[PDB]
Amino acid sequence: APADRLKALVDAAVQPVMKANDIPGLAVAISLKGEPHYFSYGLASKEDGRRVTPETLFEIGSVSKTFTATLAGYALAQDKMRLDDRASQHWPALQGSRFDGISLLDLATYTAGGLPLQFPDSVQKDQAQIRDYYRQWQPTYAPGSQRLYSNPSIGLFGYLAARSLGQPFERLMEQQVFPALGLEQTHLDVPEAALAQYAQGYGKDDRPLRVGPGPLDAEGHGVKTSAADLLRFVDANLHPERLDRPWAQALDATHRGYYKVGDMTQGLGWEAYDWPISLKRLQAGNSTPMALQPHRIARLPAPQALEGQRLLNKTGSTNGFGAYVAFVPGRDLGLVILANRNYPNAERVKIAYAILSGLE
Numbered sequence: 001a002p003a004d005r006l007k008a009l010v011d012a013a014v015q016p017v018m019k020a021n022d023i024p025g026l027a028v029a030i031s032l033k034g035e036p037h038y039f040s041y042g043l044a045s046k047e048d049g050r051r052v053t054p055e056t057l058f059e060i061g062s063v064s065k066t067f068t069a070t071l072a073g074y075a076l077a078q079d080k081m082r083l084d085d086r087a088s089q090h091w092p093a094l095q096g097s098r099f100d101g102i103s104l105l106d107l108a109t110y111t112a113g114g115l116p117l118q119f120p121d122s123v124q125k126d127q128a129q130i131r132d133y134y135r136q137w138q139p140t141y142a143p144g145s146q147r148l149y150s151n152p153s154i155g156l157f158g159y160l161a162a163r164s165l166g167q168p169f170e171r172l173m174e175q176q177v178f179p180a181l182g183l184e185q186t187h188l189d190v191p192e193a194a195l196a197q198y199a200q201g202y203g204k205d206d207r208p209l210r211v212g213p214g215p216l217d218a219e220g221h222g223v224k225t226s227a228a229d230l231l232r233f234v235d236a237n238l239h240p241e242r243l244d245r246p247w248a249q250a251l252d253a254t255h256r257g258y259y260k261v262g263d264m265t266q267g268l269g270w271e272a273y274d275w276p277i278s279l280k281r282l283q284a285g286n287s288t289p290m291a292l293q294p295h296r297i298a299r300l301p302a303p304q305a306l307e308g309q310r311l312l313n314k315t316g317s318t319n320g321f322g323a324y325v326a327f328v329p330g331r332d333l334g335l336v337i338l339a340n341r342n343y344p345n346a347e348r349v350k351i352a353y354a355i356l357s358g359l360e
């Protein structure tokens, strides 16, 4: 009966949303009382009929920002940086720029003063172009005052965290972060040997979309992973105390809230809500206006532990993929939903809410 009930719950949440949003393939992984459960639907590739499994690799887009925050958490644990550091401390090219007056915390939490959602099209994946872009950039409003969700903002945070550790970002992620977290199916650059597991992404007219190069792409949206590996990452987040101590501290650093916008408390990578909370409020926290417009923050007098009766989440999108991760620290509950269409955040949250409500 119990395995039948869980399958019925997840099928009832997933199947209508896959039909309504024409999602070719979707992987669910659930962590329930320390036990993993996997549900795989549809096709990783429509053209060759490859089915989704818990080992299928998906682009997770901005869920990558929780990995970037974890690497920064490692630099903080090693005393190589502090969140109150001026950004220009970690990159001499930025000395004399407005980054002399912007903190690593501002970059991590999208409050540097109006860094845009994307690098402009004029900035290619080129060290000199990225350097020159930040050197010339000027805030629209006071650093620390307004949240504007931004790839160049947390991209620079990750890039400077890597500089504080004296190694390239991509090398630190591959050689230290993924191995420390026990992740062997998690990649910034998918090996040839794993390419057969890499799902196709689907956009308009089912145009095929796997992400190409972009400025600070690894830091912003670089990760490809399986549902089973991303659930291992969720399980590390639910139990940081099981990791070697520097990595436990690295994960804990991502569970600290700095300010509120509406119902949402902003951490490093993770965004948190009180739990329980209505489905409409969790949808509103993950809405297009939340992501695309500036919002005045309500700064907390001291950082808040993101634990207990809270849901931590992150959405992630690329042109061809739509990911969502949520976990409830106080209930030892974790959920991963990976799809190979970029379908609306509201619909990702509808699946997640049905499952998390039904596990309770």
Ligand SMILES: *[B]([O])([O])[C][N]C(=O)/C(=N\OC([C])([C])C([O])=O)C1=[C]SC([N])=N1
Binding pocket: 060, 061, 062, 063, 117, 149, 151, 221, 291, 292, 315, 316, 317, 318, 319, 320, 342, 345
């Ligand atoms: B992360 O995945 O949130 C970063 N997202 C982006 O770079 C893109 N869109 O941002 C919004 C609209 C806020 C979103 O909901 O994801 C993005 C990159 S490629 C594409 N079609 N969208």
